[PDB]
């Protein structure tokens, strides 16, 4: 397999003089428009279904998903940010999360995106 060289994108496909090889390749590099809206939708729908969380268990629930500064913040640091302990934040996430699971299973607004 390794040995085999690449393939010229100018290699004609079919028997007719029109068709090019390269013109037959998709672009998955950039997210499709349908994905622009699909993603921008979840980025919002998760913002509105989030507001039902306590001022702690929300802003903290973002720091563990890399939602805040984009980099993920481990439990150890989160507990240092709120003044709590490496244990408290742990239970905070659990309960805060399933507490949203109730709102999800009752509103069906986000129940999609299950891929």
């Amino acid at each position: 397999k390794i040995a085999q060289e690449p393939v010229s994108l100018e290699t004609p496909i079919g028997d007719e003089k029109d068709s090019f090889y390269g013109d037959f390749i998709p672009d998955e590099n950039l997210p499709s428009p349908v994905e622009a809206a699909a993603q921008s939708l979840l980025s919002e729908e998760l913002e509105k279904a989030l507001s039902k969380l306590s001022e702690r268990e929300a802003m903290v629930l973002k720091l563990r998903k890399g939602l805040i500064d984009g980099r993920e913040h481990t439990l150890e640091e989160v507990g240092a940010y709120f003044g709590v302990t490496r244990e408290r934040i742990r239970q905070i996430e659990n309960k805060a999360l399933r507490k949203l699971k109730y709102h999800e299973s009752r509103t069906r607004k986000l129940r999609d995106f299950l891929e």
């Binding site: 809206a37 699909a38 939708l41 607004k109």
Partner: peptide, 9 residues
């Protein structure tokens, strides 16, 4: 369907 993605899929 409740929203965009919903109707979509």
């Amino acid at each position: 369907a409740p929203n965009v993605k919903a109707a979509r899929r």
